[model samples]
Target: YKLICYYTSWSQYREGDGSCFPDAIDPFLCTHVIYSFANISNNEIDTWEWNDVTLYDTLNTLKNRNPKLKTLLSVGGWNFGPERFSAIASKTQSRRTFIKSVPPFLRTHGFDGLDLAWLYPGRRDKRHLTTLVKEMKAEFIREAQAGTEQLLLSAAVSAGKIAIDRGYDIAQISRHLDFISLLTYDFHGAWRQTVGHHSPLFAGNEDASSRFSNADYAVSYMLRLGAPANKLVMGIPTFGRSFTLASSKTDVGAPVSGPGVPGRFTKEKGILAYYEICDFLHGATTHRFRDQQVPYATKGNQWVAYDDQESVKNKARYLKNRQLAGAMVWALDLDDFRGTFCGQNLTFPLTSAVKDVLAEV
Candidate 1:
């Protein structure tokens, strides 16, 4: 079983100890840690951030701390979008050019695997997405046959039904990938005028729109579509989606005027890092939804929906009950990594909770 963690490249830019580097990682915490958001250059995998090479080496040093750990590189993400991925996958030459760069890229960078996180591929244009993945897996196996260790290949795919339909040839990709990590959070966010949890484990007794958008539906859909039970990793998010209320209504589905105020460190409107939310929860009126296995908190007009240790434990138990591969944390840095912010005196409590439950027999 895998307990995967995504380490974001930009987390180091946050203020004070909020800024996290590879050194902050607990080597024992995750089985596989994928360094995220590598880009494409000249139709090949390339660094999206400066000092990526340095970070790669330092990140690999975690192996010295835990030899059983696996390190991976993820290319393309929400910000990377579909453009370059589309550009590269549209043509065989471009796909080959990209595929040829992979083994060497992972080998030299000291990565144990490659994670394809092409945010999305378009509706009619994306049969090539599977084609690209199929070819890349072939090359990976070919490389291992020639000499090197077999490189693991996994996918971080969209959880939305429309996004899934737009991009995936599910049964086909399931055969090629080692694991499929669902981008299962963000089911709701500031983009809507109404408030809702971004990552509810279950929609409970739901509406038409909310029912299909949950982790339950996403995981079930993947299983029904032919993803092997042993190769599906449910995603758990450490960040919270924030919104400012328009009126006195503070319940889920309440009217939202706009995004919540930005965090002092993450500084992104409508988004608060778990560390910020760690402090945010201190004075707020919080509720654990009886229907869904998650929490929502209100601080005056501020409303945030995010996972806490309790919700994470619930998801992990669900993961076990489903007999799936494992769980993947969206990123590590956003948690209270310094162990100072949250009142629980726990560092990465949300992340640690997953392991605690998963470690159970």
Candidate 2:
């Protein structure tokens, strides 16, 4: 099992110099690093210009430093339009058309594998779930049979029912690929109203009505759905989600007493990445629900949701107990120098924690 460090295009925001690759922090902690959405955009993928030359070049230098490091290019995040997927997953010709272009893309960009981050197939857009994975899987097999020279094929999938009923049929699709990363975070938020555990055990709360948190429900659900434990890579969010409270109600998932789910005032486009949130913890936010193993902060009217080392350790243990393949953090740039947030500096908390437990297995 490998520890995957992922980064989206927006991840570049954290770099003070506006460089694509961040400063040489701690790549050794993770086995592999993935740069997200390199192929989904026209400006980035359509042309051959190396606007990100310095970025890949830096990563290439790191590869030479550690020859075994695996770097993969991820495509199609949640915000991506479904039309592109329709074109890519429509027919054998379309699927092959897209797959054949990847090797050259990797060779040009200096990557080892491809990670597909199709946000939704069956749920968000039920229209495409039926055929997307099947077509993509067929193309992958074709690429392998055609002798593509060790192309790694992995996918990031949702942990919810949309993924279960509408996403790729894993039992049929797993045979053609390396493994699937089960996205086990983001289970609750303002979208959910009644603030509840984002990733909790199905029986996390004493209340029988409480839904399973990250491992209890997600891992078990996938296993029940026919996905092999080894083929499933659990996901860990470097950040957390927060809900505003009308009163001092800490009932997990209790509906916020206000309108609009509260989030970071400055970083509204996305949640505060782990690193930024860590820095913000100096005094900007306060911690609560320490018993539940989750961390949150509030500044006046806004609320922020996030995770800490303890939650990560618990989730990692759950992964080990379930005998899953491994865990993947959202990205590397999100962590401080020691791979922790809110002054909770530790050496790659998520990665090392997973290793500690998996070693016992």
Candidate 3:
């Protein structure tokens, strides 16, 4: 099984323990390491960070330590949105311009592949998305035939049922992709006014709506829709989603005033890094939703739902039994990589658990 890890360059900006870079990665841990977020400029692939050139060099240097490691460059994100991708994919000229940039950019940076993350595509964008992938795959094949190491193409796709249908022509797109990174997390978050696990392995005994927003539902739906099991890589988050409770009822569907307070490290509202969650565990009353196969903690008005070593291992079993390609982490930067806060005294406890359990299964 392939353990696909995503490393975020932005974490380098965080101060102290929160600060992360390629140095933090254990090259052997992730079979494939995808460097997150390169962007678009003038219909051509461009990078976001000021020092990405240097960062790319340093990141790819990990190959020296582990020859099996496969590094990729991911483009687009929530901030990048779908408009740019839509515009590019709408016309062959624009799509070609962007596609042409991929191979050079990847080879120059020493990456083995490219990950296109449009966040989502709507119904109108679906056919265009299919064509774009088809063209990209054709071009990659051309490159490989020209006597170069083959370049892989993948997409970070939407998880929800509606988003999946509207954004993808499942069978069409899946045919060209080396693998599909199914973003199974973020089933819920503070963006809504309710508290729910963002990445539950199974649906709890909650409302009907709650049933659809889970890992099992998403995986089952994709399989039902035509995604090949061996080509599907399920996403497992390394962080937790948080919310500020509107009332004191601390259940899975509790009302929320807003997102939880920003973490000291990740500094994002409604979310906490695994390290931040580690410290949050100190005074919080934690409970596991046996049916959901996930856990949450509440302290005063703040509540969080996140994966622990045990839960991620549980997800590993799900992937193994489902015969999915493997697990893909939302990020390496979010995990308590230093083992500084989690009392576990081992770096990457959550990730290690996923990998360890995956191997056994």
Candidate 4:
């Protein structure tokens, strides 16, 4: 099983001086680490505020400690938006330009591959998306023929069936990419009027709006649509989705007002890092819903949907049983990096749970 972890570039600024840098990574814990984003401007990939060369070098050096480790540079995250990708993928000239530029940039920075995290491709751009991947593979082949290392290609895909259907040509896409990282979390969050599991293993019986609003359905649908189970990696969130209750009621479908209180460390409204959630749960009343196979907690009017060690273990077992490639953490840094907040002061408890189960598998 390939244990992949995403390391974000901007996590350095999270509150409580709880920042993460390249040197902090424990390479042995994962087989691959994908750097969260490199920008795309005028169809060219560029670095953000951090020095690309320096950062890439720093990250790649971790492989020295663990020779089995691999690193990839992810391009175009949610912040980069969909327009840039749509514009580049829709046209031949732009696609060719980006394709030609990839090898040199990757080689120069020592990235073993590229991960496309475009957030999404619209329905209109489905065919264009396929063409782009095909062309990219062609470029990769050319680079390989020149005796360069063969680079891996992968993508972070949406879990929602509508987005999956609209944005992807499943069969064609699965054929070209090494793996598809299914973002199985964020099925529900503060944006909704009703509370729901952020990443349920199965749909709750009470759920009627969409049957595809759970991990099991999403993964099964992809497999049914011709995606190889071995090439599908289930995503595990290292953070929680928080919500503010609209009333005193705090059931699964209870009404929600808006985002819950921000984390003391992560400090993001509507979302809290696992460490912050750990702190929140210390004094909060937590609940485990057997139907959905997920756990949530409520503290006064604040409701949080997050994965703890047990949920992560359950997810890992699911991946193993499904014969999937492995598990991918949304990010490695968001977990209790210091080993001071959760689970007997254990560092990376969530990921550790996943690794422990996968190792057993």
Per-residue lDDT for 22-72 in model 1, tens only? 999989999999998888988888998889999999999999989999999
Give the TM-score (vs. native) of candidate 3.
0.98
Better of 2 and 3 by lDDT: 3
- Could you report the Cα RMSD, in angstroms, for every candidate shown? 1.2, 4.0, 1.1, 1.2
Worst lDDT run of 10 residues, candidate 3, spans 203-212
Overall local distance difference test of candidate 2: 0.62
Q: Write the per-residue lDDT of candidate 3 for residues 1-361, one digit (tens) a residue.
A: 9899888989899989898888788887888999989999998889899999999998999999999889989989878968888888998898999999889888877989999888889889999999999999999999997788899999998888888877789989889999999888878772877677888888777665556788899999999989999999999999998888899898656888988899988888988999899999998899998988999999988898999988999999999999999999988889988878899598888888888987784
Task: State the lDDT of candidate 4 residue by residue for 1-361, as single tens digits.
Answer: 9998999988877656478878888778889999989987677777875566777888899999998898999998977879888899988998898888888888888889999998878989889989988889878878898787798899999999999899799999898999999999968862779887889888777857778888999999999999999999999999989988999988768998888888877777898898888888878999987877889999989999999898899989998999999999998889887777776967788888899999993
CA error at residue 29 for candidate 1, angstroms: 0.5
For residues 307-344, could you state the per-residue lDDT of candidate 2 as single tens digits? 76667777777777778778888855555434434354
Q: In model 1, what is the error at residue 46, expressed in angstroms?
A: 0.7
Cα-based lDDT at residue 78, candidate 3:
73
**lDDT for residue 57 in candidate 4, whole number 0-100:** 84
Clashes of each: 0, 22, 0, 0
